[PDB]
Each structure stands twice: as structure tokens, then as C-alpha cells.
Amino acid sequence: GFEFTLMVVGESGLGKSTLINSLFLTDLYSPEYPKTVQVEQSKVLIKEGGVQLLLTIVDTPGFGDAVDNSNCWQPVIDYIDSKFEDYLNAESRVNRRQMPDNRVQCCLYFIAPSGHGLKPLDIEFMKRLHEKVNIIPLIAKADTLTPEECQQFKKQIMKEIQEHKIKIYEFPENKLVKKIKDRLPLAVVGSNTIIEVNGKRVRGRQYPWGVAEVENGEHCDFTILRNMLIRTHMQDLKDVTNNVHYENYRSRKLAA
């Protein structure tokens, strides 16, 4: 059995719940929100192929949705640092045989597909959280970008990430293989709707002019994201959470 704590952040209506529900092809996440940002948790135990995953989904309804979003990152910081604080207290006890670990191991940050670059709120959130959680920036609703637009948008976002000295999670990796960092930020399409396309039933979004396919790597990066989040990089995300973000929290608190 594994445990994974995954945080989702972005303005309402970016396909976030749809994306979570696409991860296990199951509408297992139905948040009530479609005041100040509230940080909430949902637990799902997934048993599939003789393996159990206890997934905690941490969401932040209200983020970025108000006229005045001043300090809307602060409830997110408070939640994350409070789990570091609990862990530090738990491991400092004389008897620590029971160790709960509620630390947030990944944050999907959904970027609206404007076609320009990052918004001021995107920059503030990532600058203020990047040393506290593994940030995976995602271009939301990628089926609203043409391929040329998507490539320009990715390049502009990565340039601005560098400009603001933001440290995102980059998915550390006999023939040459394109580097994953060259694909970032991943651009996703979500759907559990099955559509017949040329005699094959696929998940996608049906428009009068055609179908944007979730699992088609020429349409979006969902398959790559799902493979890394659930299978190949989950342990590394936990490792960085513990060995970097938590250890940096602890050293700061103990030195003070």
C-alpha cells in the first residue's frame, strides 16, 4: 500500500476536477465549489490490480476567483507549513512509533490558457510556494490552443519562470529520448466521455469540427502527466517533499 497527498490549485472553471477524475477514469472527485480561500481534503482508497493507493486530494476552492485576490496564497502556505509543523512535532517525540504523514507531496497549479504568459497571480503563487511544495504547472484546457500557440505559450511560461527565479518540479528522468523538461509546462485535456473516432472508442471532448482526445500525445500531455504522477515519479515527489521542502522547513524552525 501507498499513500499520496496531491494538492490542486487554480481559478474555478479550468477543468481541475475533470482532470483529477481523468486520472483513474472515475468521477471520484466531486467538489462542492464550482469568503477567504478554504483548504479542504478528500480521501479516496484506490484498490486496482492487487495494489492499494490511499490518495488525499487537497483542494483550495475560491482561489483566484474574487475581485480582490490579495493574499489568497496564504491559506495554502498555512496548510502546507502546518503539516510540516505536525511532522516535526511527531518525529521529536520520545515515542514516535506512530508517525502520521500529512505533508503535501505535489501541487498541480492550473494556468489559464490565455496564450500570452503567466498572470500576476500565477507569478505570486509560484514565487511564494515553490520552496514549500513540489509545484507542477499545468496549462489547463489545452484543446483551446492550436499547436503553434501551445508551443509559444509553453516557451513564454518557462521564460517567465526563469525570470522570476521560480523552482518548479521538473520530473527528473540505449537510445536518445527527448528530455521531459523540454515539454514543460505540460498541457492537459480532461474528459471521461467516450467517443467513437474512426472506429475506435476514445476519451475526449466532442466539437462539431472534431474530437480532442485525452490519451493522444499529439493532442495533449495528459498521458505523460498521468504516467509520471501515478507511476514513475510518485516516489520521487515524496522524496523531494521529505528531503528538501520538509528539511528546509525544519532547519529554519530549529535554527530560530
Ligand X SMILES: Nc1nc2c(ncn2[C@@H]2O[C@H](COP(=O)(O)OP(=O)(O)O)[C@@H](O)[C@H]2O)c(=O)[nH]1
For position 156 contacting ligand X by CB under 6 A, the verdict is no
**Considering only 14-22, 36-44, 226-234, 247-255, which stretch makes contact with ligand X by CB under 6 A?**
14-22
For position 105 contacting ligand X by CB under 6 A, the verdict is no
**Considering only 43-51, 79-87, 138-146, 172-180, which stretch makes contact with ligand X by CB under 6 A?**
138-146
The sheet carrying 210-213 orders its strands as: 194-197, 200-207, 210-213
C-alpha span between 10 and 12 (Å, rounded): 6
For position 118 contacting a second copy by CB under 8 A, the verdict is no
User: Least distance from C-beta 95 to a second copy, angstroms?
Assistant: 45
For 168, the grid coordinates are 518548479
For position 64 contacting ligand X by CB under 6 A, the verdict is no
φ, ψ of residue 88 to 5 degrees: the values are: -60, -40
**Considering only 51-59, 136-144, 168-176, 234-242, which stretch makes contact with a second copy by CB under 8 A?**
136-144
User: Hey, which residues between 187 and 206 contact ligand X (CB under 6 A)?
Assistant: 189-190, 205
Query: How many other C-beta atoms lie within 10 A of the C-beta of residue 3?
Result: 17
The helix/strand/coil state of 251 is helix
Chain Cα centroid distance, residue 57: 10
208's contact among ligand X, a second copy, none, with CB below 5 to 8 A by partner kind, is: a second copy
Q: Considering the complex, state which of residue 192 and residue 216 has its C-beta at the smaller distance from a second copy.
A: 216
The answer for 248, left when phi > 0, alpha when psi is -120 to 50, beta otherwise, is alpha
Q: For residue 236, what are the contacts with CB-CB under 8 A and spacing of at least 6?
A: 172
Residues that bind ligand X (CB under 6 A): 12-18, 34, 115, 141, 143-144, 149, 189-190, 205
Residues annotated in the binding site for GTP, as ranges? Answer: 10-17, 36, 62, 141-149, 190, 205
